[PDB]
Amino acid sequence: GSMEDYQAAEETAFVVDEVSNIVKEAIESAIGGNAYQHSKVNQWTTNVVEQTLSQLTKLGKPFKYIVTCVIMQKNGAGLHTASSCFWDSSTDGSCTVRWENKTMYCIVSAFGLSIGGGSGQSGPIKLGMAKITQVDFPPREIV
Amino acid sequence: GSMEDYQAAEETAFVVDEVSNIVKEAIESAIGGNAYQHSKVNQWTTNVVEQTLSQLTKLGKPFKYIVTCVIMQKNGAGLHTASSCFWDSSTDGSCTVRWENKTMYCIVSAFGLSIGGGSGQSGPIKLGMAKITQVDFPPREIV
């Protein structure tokens, strides 16, 4: 088809290295330098991404974003998650943020599916392949 | 843009009601009518979707499909999962498959992001909105 009739601007396209910082500046803004807390990270990773993931979509281009987040407990309660996702850097848009606590684990992951050619990053490019991403936190082992 | 210069065929486009059956015909093919088992469902939901999700992608159109699967245990081990996905039927492509066992839980979910106009389903259309989808299987309650 005649996609060549139009184009897209690389100056309005976002980058993974930017999105990976938008989450920190938004979390630390929500914290405001308050007292050191553990279970607060659970309400922060949810409350932040709630507006932040919406905001960074606007700092980039309009496309299908998604996120998934997994709140485990080191107290004794974990499971087998299997994620048929793929890592991409120059190929496509993907990002992720990992915030561990004293006895809790709060890990959020993001996939920004973009086919419009939004590229031009400052960092080096890396050729390779991607495969299935399983994630299992075993709370114990077999005796 | 000049997208109107080309088109897409609705006769090659898949439907959610079809994909929702491709999983059963593939699972029961892998079972072959063998002895009744519990932990087998875990190897079946993984092994099937491994080739089946690849196959139904070919029975439809070439696009970015993803799946996520969450294997819990009713023995005492569950967690807080939070999925910023959305349900769609006529708007976009989404499907999901739920296989519970005696003491185990095996739930797989799928998102088939398709903007090419692949529609024309046999079932009725339903207008509405979609929101954030949390998944929490509490193994106990607070005393």
CB A78 within 8 A of CB A143: no
DSSP alpha helices (H): ranges in chain B?
Answer: 16-31, 40-59
Question: What range defines the domain where residue B31 resides?
Answer: 1-143
In the block, tokens 């519970």 appear at B100
Query: Of chain A residues 10-29, which have a CB less than 8 A from chain B?
Result: none
Q: Which candidate, A90, A120, A115, places its Cα nearest to that of A10?
A: A120
How many CB atoms are closer than 10 A to CB A20? 14
Strand partners for A73 = A77, A104
User: Measured between alpha carbons, how far is A38 from A109 in angstroms, rounded to an integer?
Assistant: 20
CB B5 within 8 A of CB A2: yes
State both tokens at B142: 């607070």
User: Measured between alpha carbons, how far is B107 from B72 in angstroms, rounded to an integer?
Assistant: 9
Closest residue in chain A to residue B1, using alpha carbons only? A6
CB B99 within 8 A of CB B88: no
A79 with B68: Cβ contact below 8 A: no
Sequence-distant (≥ 6) Cβ neighbours of residue A26 within 8 angstroms: A48, A51, A52, A55
Strand partners for B64 = B113
Sheet containing strand A64-73, strands side by side: A93-100, A104-113, A64-73, B80-83, B133-136
State both tokens at A63: 């496309």
Q: Is the dihedral of CA A25, A107, B49, B90 positive or negative?
A: negative
A135–chain B Cβ distance below 8 A for any pair:
no
* Chains A, B: CB pairs < 8 Å: 88
CB A131 within 8 A of CB A82: no
State both tokens at A113: 């599916």
Query: How far, CA to CA in Å, does B100 sit from each of A14, A116, B45, B50, B97?
Result: 41, 41, 11, 19, 10
How many CB atoms are closer than 10 A to CB B100? 13
- How many residues are present in chain A? 143
Between the two ends of chain A, the Cα-to-Cα distance in Å is 61
Mutate to test the interface with A, among B39, B47, B80 (most CBs of A within 10 A): B80
Strand partners for B131 = none
Chain B: nearest CA to A86, how far in angstroms? 9
Instruction: Choose the closest CB to B68 out of A42, A83, A113.
Output: A83
Q: Which amino acid is at B77?
A: A
Q: Count of domains in chain A?
A: 1
Beta-strand pair A133-136/A64-73: unpaired
Instruction: Choose the closest CB to A71 out of B77, B79, B139.
Output: B79
State both tokens at B11: 């006769």
Q: Which candidate, A110, A88, A122, places its Cα nearest to that of A18?
A: A122
A130–chain B Cβ distance below 8 A for any pair:
no
Q: Which residues from A are below 8 Å from B53, CB to CB? A: 84
Give CA torsion, residues B84, A48, A44, A103, to 10 deg: 50
Q: How was this structure determined?
A: NMR
Element (H, E) at A26: helix A16-31
